[PDB]
Amino acid sequence: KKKPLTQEQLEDARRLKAIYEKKKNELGLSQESVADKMGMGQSGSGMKIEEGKLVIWINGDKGYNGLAEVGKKFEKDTGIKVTVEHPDKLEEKFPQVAATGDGPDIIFWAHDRFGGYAQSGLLAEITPDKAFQDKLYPFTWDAVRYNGKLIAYPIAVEALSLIYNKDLLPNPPKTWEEIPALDKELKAKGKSALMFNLQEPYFTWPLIAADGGYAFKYENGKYDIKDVGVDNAGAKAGLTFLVDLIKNKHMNADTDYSIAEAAFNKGETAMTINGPWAWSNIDTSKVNYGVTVLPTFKGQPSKPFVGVLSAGINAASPNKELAKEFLENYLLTDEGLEAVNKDKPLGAVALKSYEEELAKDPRIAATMENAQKGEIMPNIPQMSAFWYAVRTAVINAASGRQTVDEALKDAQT
Numbered sequence: 264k265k266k267p268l269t270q271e272q273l274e275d276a277r278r279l280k281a282i283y284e285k286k287k288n289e290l291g292l293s294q295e296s297v298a299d300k301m302g303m304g305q306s307g308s309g310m311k312i313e314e315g316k317l318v319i320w321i322n323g324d325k326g327y328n329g330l331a332e333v334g335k336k337f338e339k340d341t342g343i344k345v346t347v348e349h350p351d352k353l354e355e356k357f358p359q360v361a362a363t364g365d366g367p368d369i370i371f372w373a374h375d376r377f378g379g380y381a382q383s384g385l386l387a388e389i390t391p392d393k394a395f396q397d398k399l400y401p402f403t404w405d406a407v408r409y410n411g412k413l414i415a416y417p418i419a420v421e422a423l424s425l426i427y428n429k430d431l432l433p434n435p436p437k438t439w440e441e442i443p444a445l446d447k448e449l450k451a452k453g454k455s456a457l458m459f460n461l462q463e464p465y466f467t468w469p470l471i472a473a474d475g476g477y478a479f480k481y482e483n484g485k486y487d488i489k490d491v492g493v494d495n496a497g498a499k500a501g502l503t504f505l506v507d508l509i510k511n512k513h514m515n516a517d518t519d520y521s522i523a524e525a526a527f528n529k530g531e532t533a534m535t536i537n538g539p540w541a542w543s544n545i546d547t548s549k550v551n552y553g554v555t556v557l558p559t560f561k562g563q564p565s566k567p568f569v570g571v572l573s574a575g576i577n578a579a580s581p582n583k584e585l586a587k588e589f590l591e592n593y594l595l596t597d598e599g600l601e602a603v604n605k606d607k608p609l610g611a612v613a614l615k616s617y618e619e620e621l622a623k624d625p626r627i628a629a630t631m632e633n634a635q636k637g638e639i640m641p642n643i644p645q646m647s648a649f650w651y652a653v654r655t656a657v658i659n660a661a662s663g664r665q666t667v668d669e670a671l672k673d674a675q676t
């Protein structure tokens with residue numbers, strides 16, 4: 264308190280403070296900190312994610328109610344509350360919130376996005392022992408391995424199939440090339456041959472890859488990011504066929520997931536292209552449907568990009584042990600996967616014991632044959648940029664805003 268200070272000394276300090284404050288106000292920071300704007304300090308205090316519970320994000324097309332049921336079982340046994348959410352644009356929101364040390368404890372998505380999350384430091388290395396690993400197929404662990412480390416638990420192996428209305432079309436086409444004539448036939452009955460989501464490149468990729476399109480060349484155990492196959496002859500032939508379908512009025516460039524689903528389930532179109540998650544709504548519909556191998560293009564199989572639905576653990580989570588216990592001992596069991604599967608079908612699961620049951624289902628057999636004909640997606644960090652590039656190319660080529668040659672030239676970097 265009692266200091267040997269004169270008014271002149273205090274005045275000198277007053278002036279220095281005022282010089283500082285004058286600059287601060289001129290910089291428009293009357294209400295903010297200088298050090299914050301310099302990106303100094305932290306963000307944040309390492310405690311945004313609540314300790315002692317689990318928050319889980321999964322896409323809204325998956326069996327999130329069945330997953331929440333597994334969460335309730337977990338809570339009954341352990342007292343740990345599990346909250347399941349399905350935010351829109353989850354795969355964009357997760358990296359944004361997790362970068363700040365926030366977000367869910369566990370994030371579900373196909374494995375392709377996970378290498379980018381891991382490179383950004385957003386995903387924990389997972390630690391299942393060999394005995395647990397032995398319960399899932401080796402190729403599924405491979406999909407979630409990034410630079411030697413396991414960075415997610417694999418859940419299910421997803422591939423697109425051709426889904427068809429057996430009453431309108433007891434005999435589904437073998438080839439993409441048959442579709443225009445089939446559409447002309449069905450149009451005379453007030454129906455169309457085929458509708459599927461043209462807004463997400465996932466759905467058009469199997470045709471683009473058929474005759475030779477590819478994302479990143481894989482050689483000697485590594486992906487060459489300098490060798491991209493989005494604008495080669497095969498990719499062009501595939502996308503040109505799609506564009507010709509639109510030019511010839513066999514499909515509408517505007518068709519999206521809900522337009523195609525509503526039209527197929529109402530019985531207005533004879534075929535759609537979709538994954539196992541979609542089977543539940545068709546089951547509810549009046550449609551008698553089959554699930555079969557995708558049409559060939561130029562005599563070669565369609566090659567869907569295969570996604571392994573996977574559960575990653577937020578690096579910021581203080582609940583990594585709770586998450587491990589939940590995922591290994593509750594979800595990845597016959598009863599856990601059945602709960603999710605009964606809600607929206609997972610397709611072919613990574614867990615050997617449960618996959619052996621489901622394999623009897625002809626819809627799963629067809630999923631697996633389409634998966635086998637395609638390729639497991641890379642998980643490299645360049646995947647997000649690839650998908651954005653191809654999404655743009657397909658939408659622009661389909662709508663006619665650009666030619667196929669120009670759109671694919673733009674996508675190639």
Ligand SMILES: OC[C@H]1O[C@H](O[C@H]2[C@H](O)[C@@H](O)[C@@H](O)O[C@@H]2CO)[C@H](O)[C@@H](O)[C@@H]1O
Nearest residue numbers: 322324373375376463464465466570650
């Ligand atoms: O369309 C690009 C998109 O494809 C894949 O997303 C799939 C996903 O794997 C399926 O689980 C399902 O939810 O439909 C999505 C397509 O709408 C990639 O996994 C994704 O990263 C990519 O953006």
